[PDB]
Amino acid sequence: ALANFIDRAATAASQVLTDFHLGDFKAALEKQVVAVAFDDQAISCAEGQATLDLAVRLLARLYPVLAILPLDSAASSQAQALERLAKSINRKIGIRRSGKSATVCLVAGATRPSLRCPTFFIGSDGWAAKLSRTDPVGSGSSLLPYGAGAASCFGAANVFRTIFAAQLTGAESDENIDLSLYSYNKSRAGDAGPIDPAVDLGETHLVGLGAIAHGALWALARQSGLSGRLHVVDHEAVELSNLQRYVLAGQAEIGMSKAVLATTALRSTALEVEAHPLKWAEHVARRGDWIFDRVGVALDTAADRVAVQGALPRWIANAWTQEHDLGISRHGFDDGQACLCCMYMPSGKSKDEHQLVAEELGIPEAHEQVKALLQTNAGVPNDFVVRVATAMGVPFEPLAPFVGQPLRSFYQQAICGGLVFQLSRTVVPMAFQSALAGIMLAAELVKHSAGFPMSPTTSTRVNLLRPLGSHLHDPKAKDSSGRCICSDEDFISAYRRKYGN
Amino acid sequence: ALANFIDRAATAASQVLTDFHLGDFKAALEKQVVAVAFDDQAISCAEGQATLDLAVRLLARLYPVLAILPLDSAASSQAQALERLAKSINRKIGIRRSGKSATVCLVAGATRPSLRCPTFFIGSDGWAAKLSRTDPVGSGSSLLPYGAGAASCFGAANVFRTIFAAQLTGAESDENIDLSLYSYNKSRAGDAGPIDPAVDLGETHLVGLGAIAHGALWALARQSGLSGRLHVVDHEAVELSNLQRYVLAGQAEIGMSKAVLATTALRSTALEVEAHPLKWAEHVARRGDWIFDRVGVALDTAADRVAVQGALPRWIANAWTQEHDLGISRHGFDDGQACLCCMYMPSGKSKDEHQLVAEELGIPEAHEQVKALLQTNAGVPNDFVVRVATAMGVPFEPLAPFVGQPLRSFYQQAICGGLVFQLSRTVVPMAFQSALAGIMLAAELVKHSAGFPMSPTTSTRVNLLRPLGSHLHDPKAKDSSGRCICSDEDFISAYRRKYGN
Amino acid sequence: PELQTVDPEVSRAKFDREISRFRPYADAYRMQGCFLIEESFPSAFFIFASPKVKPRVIGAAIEIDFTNYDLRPPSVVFVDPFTRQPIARSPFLCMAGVREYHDNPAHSGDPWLLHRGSGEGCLAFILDKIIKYG
Amino acid sequence: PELQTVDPEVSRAKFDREISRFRPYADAYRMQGCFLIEESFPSAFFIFASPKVKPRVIGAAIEIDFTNYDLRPPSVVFVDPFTRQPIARSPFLCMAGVREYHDNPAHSGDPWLLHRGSGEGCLAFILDKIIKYG
Amino acid sequence: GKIEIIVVVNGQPTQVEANPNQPLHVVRTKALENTQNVAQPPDNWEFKDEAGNLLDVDKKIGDFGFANTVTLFLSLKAGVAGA
Amino acid sequence: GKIEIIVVVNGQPTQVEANPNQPLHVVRTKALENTQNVAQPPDNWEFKDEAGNLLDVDKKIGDFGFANTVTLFLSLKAGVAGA
Ligand SMILES: [Zn+2]
Ligand SMILES: [Zn+2]
Structure with missing residues (x-):
């Protein structure tokens, strides 16, 4: 009863599991029965419905057999909804x-189920996400999705670290979470x-409508x-493998424009959503x-x-997921703080020709010889070519004609020409990472536009392959090389011309 | 006792005398004794001294023997002045x-001298020039030179038409003149x-400092x-032949810069004279x-x-002398009247290539054949070349190589190349013309700057080889081709930008 | 040399207008091999290369002077393309509208003030002949 | 194609400044055979002719694009001098400061933001190399 | 209806009677003889009306629409000599 | 005078005692072992102070002029994945 996208999931787990074996992983999954239990308290409020919704959206993208357990009769209604939802994602799910x-x-x-297996109580109160391994936490009564949806993510994360504990280092189950979003x-x-x-x-403007954006759209719909x-804004369409993280894409959305999906998802909100099946540069060109x-x-x-920062928006909320981490960074351009470009500035410095050519050939040690050959x-x-060939892991015979030729001719054809690369890891994140960064990106955009005070640090990061960090703030300072665009007086004039100060 | 410049004078008379013979002319002059008689009334005023001064400046540039006749003792003083002045112009004068x-x-x-020869009484009153063949006219008491100096010119003109009457047609002596200047x-x-x-x-600005300008400087000095x-403004120097018309150039001024002469001549006036030994274009360039x-x-x-009009002065007074005529024309640029450029606009119209080439070859009759040869x-x-050669008065053999060549090659080398011109009359005016146009140019500049009402007609002309015209006004209308610069909206804007309206 | 004697407000206004009317047709001229290199009162420097002739060679470079322009016709001087210096040795441009024609005494019978205002002696007229017979 | 995504107030200000700093040296470049034919945001078209080589032939014509300029490096494309169309067939300009270099994956280790602000990738730098090795 | 023209010829006025079917160069020939101005070629003379407009000598005297008495001018081109 | 550093390592704080003559990559090695973050190459980690300035791991711990108790950050580079 594994999903028809189960391979994209195995790829995602093969980047986080020590000693990954594909047949074993699939067999581990089939021994599991992940249960969602809920009572009258959960189903009688917006927060509880949200938490149940996102939990099943996450769990159904990995596990072949779920247990949908209503604990009283008030939940019997919600339990059919959740069954339906899981079956829309994986029609062969048990x-x-x-x-x-x-x-x-x-x-x-x-309500406690009286189950013998490890049990996580998840819930919320407004902005608060709540997990407990010992006691119910209940759902609050607000119309905010952020606490509710983050808890679904912590729960889904804890389900995964409990099943796959042997293949994960320092990945203890959380005993308690109570995190204000x-x-x-x-x-x-x-x-x-x-x-x-x-x-x-x-x-x-919400640019890029993939896995992270789906968590944001989940939250804004709610x-x-x-x-x-x-x-x-996005030009692409949903593919089968995407259903491993896209919490708003079931089997029906396969082949659908991501921009169209985003609009349908918000159709009952009071937002005036505009779909652009375009790249960012086309959206910017057409807006003018x-x-x-x-x-x-x-x-x-x-x-x-x-490139988004180059268009000089008033303020940016940036979101990402990598192997051991997910986070969001905020950016005004004329604020004394880092801009979006600071976050991705290249490290190092410009090197002399002789040092760059020696490095790209795999012989940094030979910089002095390289310098001379260019003079x-x-x-x-x-022996110079035998050393470059060895250093680069590349047969000698292809490079043999360059012996006796100038170093520039060699460097031109083997490097600039791409020869040695002919002779010679996409990071797929876990659904619960993409969802929570998306939810966090929504909370930033909403908080910024509500005019709430903004985070002290440039970023806020979370690692879901471990227990929650206790200090989630991550400082980043304005880039100081002078080479970033937030140092540039022309960029600063264009911003102040549009937005004041 | 003919002047060392007597040949330039014979050239001037050879353009106005029928059947000019050079040896005869010189012999006619040597039979003459031209007399200047004057009394206490003449010498006791500015006008009388001016009239005597200019009379001797004119007569001494042609006649070999003068009679300086003081009629009482009050004039004995002036008579030495006049003797001196004549000898400064022609040291060998009798x-x-x-x-x-x-x-x-x-x-x-x-005072009447009781001489048997033809006698002209010349004088003035302010702006009035006065000649009489019958009775004294006397000199007035103003500080204006214009009436006084014009009378010297009419007298000098009448002396000439009386000596050379046989060689002159319709050149009667004036019996009376009374002309307001x-x-x-x-x-x-x-x-x-x-x-x-x-x-x-x-x-x-007084541009050009030759014969006409000397009459103007005579008047302004007085x-x-x-x-x-x-x-x-003038770059040149006085030459010997110039002493035939330059009323302010004696033998001493030969080789002197015309611009320097003009300044010396005004040294006792209250004018701030600036000498520019330059061409007009250099004066204009340097002023900026x-x-x-x-x-x-x-x-x-x-x-x-x-070219002067092109610099767009506020107002111009233009002066000239030709064979049968002298005159001055006035010019504001934005006044509905003619500008200086109108006076010299070319006549005709632009002709088609075939008609122009036929005319420059001397075969206008052959326009149709010329058109075809160019097609x-x-x-x-x-026979075409024999006809062009004949028409142009030019041997055939030089043109012979062009037979059988294209018409353009022929036209290019014989016309544009200047060939036929290789195979192939400066107007020298009488001193009394140059002087009176100069005096008239002074009167315009003074009247214009005094703000007096200006002449109804564009020009005012005089012919001194005949009795005075009775209608001296000459109308000229604004050029109407549209090709003159007073039609041009850019020129009109530049003028109004500098001077208003 | 011709010094500027016309009120330069006039000549500079007309020079600028000629350039203005050249700018829309700059692409069309490039196709025929005509490139405005530099424009600054009173000179316009162009270079000429045959577009059909390959190798594509600079075959003419001229400076068109508009001093005293339009009371006086413009001058066309063939100069060296890099050094901007006149080259020694209808060829030379004996045509109405060009100062070198009107200042030829052999063409005294065709004075410029007969052609003023008529389109002869403008920048397009000169360029169009140079390309046509070039 | 690179579309303009940077606020064009930025890119157009820097483009204009590059041209401004080219204008004093326009005569010096002409001597070496370098003529700015057309300048209009974001392109600059130049033509190149060897001054010593006679016959004096157009031997290169380029368009330097400054789209997104200075967040992104400028592009140098060899075009046909008359038709302005790219010609097919370090040669090609694999040098830092030029977009075609930085977009080569083999030069991924030398990203442009290491060289930004330093004079590499300005108009003089590109022209000076083209003349030097040309 | 014959017209009585006064032609000022180089400042000297004279009077020529003209019939309206004659071309204007007849009045020109006649005025130039009354004033003995026949040396210069007659094309050197500019026939102008009182506002100084240049008149065609081939056009017929009636075509100018002159009144019974009219004053014309027969004047030389303005000169160029001054030095 | 030895310094007591609290290194927040990927959100997990830990404490390393340092002597001022040690280079800073000793505190980095130690914090990365206390938190079992030894898989990734250690160059992947950015050692930053509380204002988020990037610190040289070769520079000696005393050369930073830290107080007796200081809080540093050991953080990954910002990620790029979002689709
Ligand atoms: Zn920045
Ligand atoms: Zn005019």
């Missing part, structure tokens, strides 16, 4: 209505973040009280305005992210 | 102190022009009460101002005169 065989369990609401600190009684969900997004205009109030970036390369423009000796 | 042998006589003042009409009692000599010239600044309040033009070619680009036949 569904049990008994906990007898359950191997892990997530619980929302106030407003402050990213441990929630305190004194500072309860604002529950009012009346926030105007202005004209906000905060009634958002108004404003939202441009969603160059005034961007708020941009939320969930693209896939550093180059694409830096004298002399023919490279035989 | 001077008599008896009228016995006189053949013609000019008389200033109130203010109105250029016969002077009337009702309209006595202003005698006040307080006139400010502003910044006035109107005390002129103030202002005067730029005199392009604001010219008043320009008085006494140049020698139409091209030079038109077909065919070889010109033999």
Whole structure:
């Protein structure tokens, strides 16, 4: 009952599991029965429905057999919804209505199932995400999805670290979580973040509509009280393998334009969503305005992210996932802090020609000999080519004609010409990472436009392959080389011309 | 006792005398004794001294023997001055102190000499020039030189037409002249022009400092009460032959810069004279101002005169002498009237290539054949070249190689190349013409800057080889081809930008 | 040399207008091999290369002077393309509208003021002949 | 194609400044055979002719594109001098400061943001190399 | 209706009677003889009306629409000599 | 005078005692072992102070002029994956 996308999932787990074996992983999954139990308290509120929704959206993208366990009769209704939802993602998924065989369990609401397997109680209160291995935590009564949805992510993360504990180092189960998604600190009684969900997004651009963006769209669909205009931008369509992280893409959305999916998903919100089945550069070219109030970036390369900053939006919320980490960074351009381009600036310095050519040939040690060969423009000796060939892991015979030729001719054809590369790891994240970074990107865009005070640090990061960090803030300082565009007086004038100060 | 410049004089007379014979002309001159008689009335005023001065400046440039005749003892002083002046112009000139042998006589003042020869009484009153063959006319008491100096010119003109009457057609002696130099009409009692000599010239440029300019400088030296600044402009120096018309150049000024002469001549006036030993274009280049309040033009070619108008002065007074005529024309540029360029516009229209080539070869009749030869680009036949050679008065053998060549090759080398011109009359005016046009140019510049009403007609002309015209006004209308610069909106904007309206 | 004697407000206004009317047709001229290199009152420097002739060689370089322009016709001087110096040795441009024609005494019968205002002696007219017979 | 994504107030300001710093040295470049034919954001078209080589032939014509310029390096394309169309067939300009170098994966180790602000990738640098090895 | 023209010829006025079917160069020939101005070629003379407009000598005297008495001018071109 | 450093390593804080004559990559080695972050190559980690300035791991711990108790950060480079 593994999903037809189960291979993209195995790729994702093969980047985080020590001693990954594909047939073993699939067989580990088939021994599992992951249970979702819920009662009248969970189903009687927006937060509880949200937490159950995202939990099943995550669990159904990995496990072949789920147990959907309503604990009283009030939940019997929600339990059919959840069964339906899981079957829309994986039509061959197994569904049990008994906990007898359950191997892990997530619980929302106030009622303990009396199951023998490891059980995580997940819930929320407004901005607070709540997990407990010992006691129910219940769902609050706000119209905010952020605490609710983050808890689904922590639960889904804990289900995974419990099943695959032997293949994971320092990946203990959380015993308690109580994380404010407003402050990213441990929630305190004194500072309860604002529950009012009346926030105007202005004209906000959400660029890139893949895995991270789906968590953002999940959250924005579930905060009634958002108004404003939202441009969603992406040229691609959903593919089968994408259903391993895209929490809003079931089997039906395969082949659908990502921009069209994003609009359908918000169709019952009060937002005026504009779908652009375009690349960012085409969206920018056609708008011809160059005034961007708020941009939320969930693209896939550093180059694409830096290009957004070049258009000089008023403020950016940037989101990412890597192997041991996920996070979001905020960016105004004229604020004394780092800009989006600072985050991806290249490290090092420009090297002299002789040092660069020696490095690209795999012989940094030979810089002095390289320097001379470029001065004298002399023919490279035989041992020089045997050393470059060895250093680069490449047969000698292809490089043999360059013996006695100038070093430049050699360097030109083997490097600039791409010869040695002919002679010679996409990071796939876990669904619960993509979802939580997406949820965190939504919370930034909403908080920024609500005018709440902004995080002290440039970034806020989370590692879901370990227990939650206790200090989730990550400082990054403005780049100081002078080579970043936030140092450039022309860029600073263009920004101040559009937005003041 | 003929002057060392007597040949330039014979050239001047050879353009006005029928059946000129050089040896005869010189022998006619040596039979003459031209007398200047004057009394106490003439010498006791500015006008009388001026008239005597210019009379001897003119007569001494042609006649070999003069009679300087003081009629009482009051004139004995002036008579030495006049003797000196004549000897400064022609050191070998004969001077008599008896009228016995006189053949013609000019008389200033109130006293009749009782000479048997033809006698002209010349005088003035302010702006009025006065000649009489019958009775004294006397000199007035103003500080204006214009009436006085014009009378010297009419007298000198009448002396010449009386000596050389047989060689001149329709050149009767004037019996009476009474010409206002203010109105250029016969002077009337009702309209006595202003005698006040307080006139400010502003910044006035006098371009070209030759024969005409010398009459202007004569007059300006002799109107005390002129103030202002005067730029005199000319690069050349006085030559021997020039002493035939330059009334302010004696033997001493030979080799002197014309610009330096003009300044010396005004050294006792209240004018601030600036000498420019430059061409007009160099004066204009160095000034870099392009604001010219008043320009008085006494140049020698139409091209030079038109170039002055191009600099767009506020107002121009233009002066000239030709064979049967002398005159001055006035010019503001934005005044509905003709500009200086109108006066010299070329006549005709642009002709088609075939008509121009046929005319320049001397075969206008052959336009149709010329047109064809340029179409077909065919070889010109033999009879075509025999016809062009005949028409142009030019041997055939030089043109013979062009038979059978294209018409363009022929036209290029015989015309554009200047061939036929290799195979193939400077107008020298009478001193009394140059002097009177110069005096008339001075009167315009002074009247214009005094703000007096300006002449109704564009020009005012005089023919001194005949009795005075009775209608001296000459109308010229604005050029109407549209090709003159006073039609051009850019020129009109540049003028209005500098001077208003 | 011709010094500027016309009020330069006039000549400089007309020079600028000629350039203005050249700018829309700059692409069309490039196809025929005509490139405006430098434009600054009173000179315009062009270079000429045959587009059909290959190798594509610089075969002419001229400076068109508009001093005293339009009271006086413009001058066309063939100069060296790099050094901007006149080269020694209808060829030479004996045509109406060009100062070198009108200042030839053999062409005294065809004075420029007969052709003024008519389109002869503008920048397009000179360029169009140079390309046509070039 | 590279579309303009940088706020064009930025790129157009820097493009204009590059041209401004080219104008004083326009005469010096002409001597070496370098003529700015057309300048209009974002392209600069030059033509190249050897001054010592006679016949004096157009031997190179390039368009330097400054789209997204200075966040992104400029592109140098060899085009046909008249038709302005790219010609087919270090040669090609694999040098730092030129977009075609930085977009080569073999030069991924030398990203442009290491060289930004330093004079590499300005208009004089590109022209000076083209003349030197040309 | 015959017209009585006064031609000022180089400052000397004279009077020529003209019939309107004659071309204007008849009045020109006649005025130039009354004033003995026959040396110079007659094309050197500019026939102008009182506002100084240049008149065609081939055009017929009636075509100018002159009144019964008219004053014309027969004047030389402006000179160029001054040095 | 030995310094007590708290290194937040990928959100997990730990404590390393340092002597000022040690180079900073000793505190880096030690914090990365306390937190079992030894898989990734250690150059993948950015040693930053609380204002997020990047610190040289070769420079000696005393040369940074830290107080007796200091909090540093051992953080990964910002990621690029989002699709
Ligand atoms: Zn930055
Ligand atoms: Zn005019």
